[PDB]
Write a protein that binds this ligand. Sequence first.
Ligand SMILES: C[C@@H]1CC(=O)NN=C1c1ccc(NC2=C(Cc3cccc(I)c3)C(=O)CCC2)cc1
Ligand SMILES: C[C@@H]1CC(=O)NN=C1c1ccc(NC2=C(Cc3cccc(I)c3)C(=O)CCC2)cc1
Ligand SMILES: [Mg+2]
Ligand SMILES: [Mg+2]
Ligand SMILES: [Mg+2]
Ligand SMILES: [Mg+2]
Ligand SMILES: [Mg+2]
Lengths: 363, 363
Amino acid sequence: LDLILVEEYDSLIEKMSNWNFPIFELVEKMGEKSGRILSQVMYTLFQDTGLLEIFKIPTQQFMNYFRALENGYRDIPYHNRIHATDVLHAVWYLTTRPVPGLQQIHNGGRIAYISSKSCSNPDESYGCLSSNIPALELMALYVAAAMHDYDHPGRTNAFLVATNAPQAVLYNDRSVLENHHAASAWNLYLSRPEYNFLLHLDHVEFKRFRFLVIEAILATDLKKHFDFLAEFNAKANDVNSNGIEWSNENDRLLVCQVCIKLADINGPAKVRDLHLKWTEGIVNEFYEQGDEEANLGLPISPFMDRSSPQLAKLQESFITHIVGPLCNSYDAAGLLPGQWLESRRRIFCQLMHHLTENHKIWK
Amino acid sequence: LDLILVEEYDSLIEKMSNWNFPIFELVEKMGEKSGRILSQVMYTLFQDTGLLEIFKIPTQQFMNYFRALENGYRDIPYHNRIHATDVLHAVWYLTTRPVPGLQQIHNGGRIAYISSKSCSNPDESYGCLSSNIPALELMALYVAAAMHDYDHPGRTNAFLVATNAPQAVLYNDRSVLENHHAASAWNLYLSRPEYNFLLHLDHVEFKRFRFLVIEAILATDLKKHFDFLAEFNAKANDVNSNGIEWSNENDRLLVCQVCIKLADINGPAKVRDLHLKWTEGIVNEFYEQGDEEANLGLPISPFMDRSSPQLAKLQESFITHIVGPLCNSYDAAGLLPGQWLESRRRIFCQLMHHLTENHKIWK
Ligand SMILES: C[C@@H]1CC(=O)NN=C1c1ccc(NC2=C(Cc3cccc(I)c3)C(=O)CCC2)cc1
Ligand SMILES: C[C@@H]1CC(=O)NN=C1c1ccc(NC2=C(Cc3cccc(I)c3)C(=O)CCC2)cc1
Ligand SMILES: [Mg+2]
Ligand SMILES: [Mg+2]
Ligand SMILES: [Mg+2]
Ligand SMILES: [Mg+2]
Ligand SMILES: [Mg+2]
């Protein structure tokens, strides 16, 4: 409302500048307009990174699409607009904040690079992925986060598969959910001219962007979790490996894929209060799949029977086997944003500590 | 009351026992009932192998389903019912006839194996894949040959992706056609109970069968050709390896996938008369696609311009870069059914001869 448009932006930016962004408060603060949280956060971020400028993105069609995408998220405990916004905030944060030791290459026809206005590298001893990953590719990453769980039913792929859901048959049982999120969101994008916010990309650019978004969204199928980790590890952490070549297209993508994977399951690397909040969501969603499995005569899957819960086993397990090694690898590659110390170690990494702390709760 | 049945059977079997099975003569002989050529061939091969007996397959539902499958193939010049019958004939043949040097591991438990009634290994110096690959797996391979190009539109994946066809968007530009052939054919199968010829397989066997059929059909996407060839040459044709491990599920599957890939593009490895009949079909199909491309103001694809043909370059290239290396690769593995001349020392393989000869036509 004139001068309130700026106060709203500057404040949100202020709150999001935190890894432990108090996202639920924002939800509470939006009140009856909390259903527009994903589109609102998108606008703010594409503006923080200068993406609207770089690709001459028209505001109207940009908001039309993301407003329509939002309403595509179901009202379920975990895989909703809020989780999508959460994942978006994570990748935006992980690709723009200072990282100790990271080597730079190029900041700002030619290949454009973004740069967050809400943060900067303290000195030449830091670096950010945004100086090594072109704008288009990071834009693809942000967009993929927004669409990555679009129209999620609150059920797993094995559930869909085991019950011969039409969606599973349609996708031959492969990454059923992930294929549907990507196909539906792109279907949505191409269904109306008023959504065409990428109209200024040339045909080659648009085609590559579509490919990237799809590649990030499919990377979120946990079934391929171990193949992805192996690859990434082989590229930067394993001995012999030359490391990540930032000038190599496939290396960038892989990094980005790993980045959205970490963001997608970020809960345990957040402050306890946030962690316990996302924990409650996934278990409530599981119980719902369990009630349906039982009603269908099927055996209740492990961790989904409310009358026989194993909440600590779930978090202990899932952290030890999936989240942990993943953050471990990303961190061992020197990509986690953090700060120099000069405790006993020279670098303090906030998520690494949250992860450890939250792990004691359940171990 | 039913004598004119066995005459047919013994006839067709006699004719199919030949690599250069005169499939076009059979289309003629069937006259008006030729539209049911695939279902009829399926039944004949399932008797020949004993799959009907092994899996207690009820004739009624079996014929119902494969008659429905057949009518799903469009009336186009190459990717039709006949082509599917051709591929079907080729996987059965590659899998049942004598292979020089192939150890007769399963020379006769709980796991069933099929045996073609129309042939046998003259002796110990011969073998056959039907003895190293379980009945359930070969059955999946045959059923996939049956369904592999179901509801093919006579257009390429590239064309689909470019015109942004709904199916292209629905599958995220990944093996569009192949995913659709498999998804449509399983949807059909499940749409009605009178199609359930597999009702005597347990949910475990059926689930695995489904997986194998999908794996085989998706393996026919030429986009993944060099990957399969490479992944194959590793496990079967290179360094410090004694080759395949018939005991290994994955190795078995890779063998099956290369077998259906060969059968899928078998034309140039058949006798000159068969080779040219298939060549004619593929060129007319490319021309129909090229007309639509021009009509849409799109650039006409290579080899698809009927006003500026390159028929010889097409065949010479495709044999040199695709068919050829796939066979040489399959041969070095030693899986080709052939014959020693004069046994041991050397082996005469009919398909390699045809291939070399047909190449001379265009080079
Ligand atoms: C990251 C979130 C939030 C949090 O703080 N804690 N826990 C979380 C969380 C916990 C479990 C899962 N698991 C998911 C599973 C895999 C899985 C299911 C049960 C046990 C384990 I072992 C792994 C699937 O295949 C489909 C939906 C995602 C996903 C997220
Ligand atoms: C095996 C058949 C029958 C025969 O006897 N000769 N030729 C055959 C034949 C020739 C070419 C193709 N090509 C197909 C192409 C790839 C391709 C297209 C143009 C040049 C080359 I280089 C390769 C696609 O991506 C989609 C449909 C299948 C398919 C079959
Ligand atoms: Mg998901
Ligand atoms: Mg998610
Ligand atoms: Mg109930
Ligand atoms: Mg095909
Ligand atoms: Mg085919």
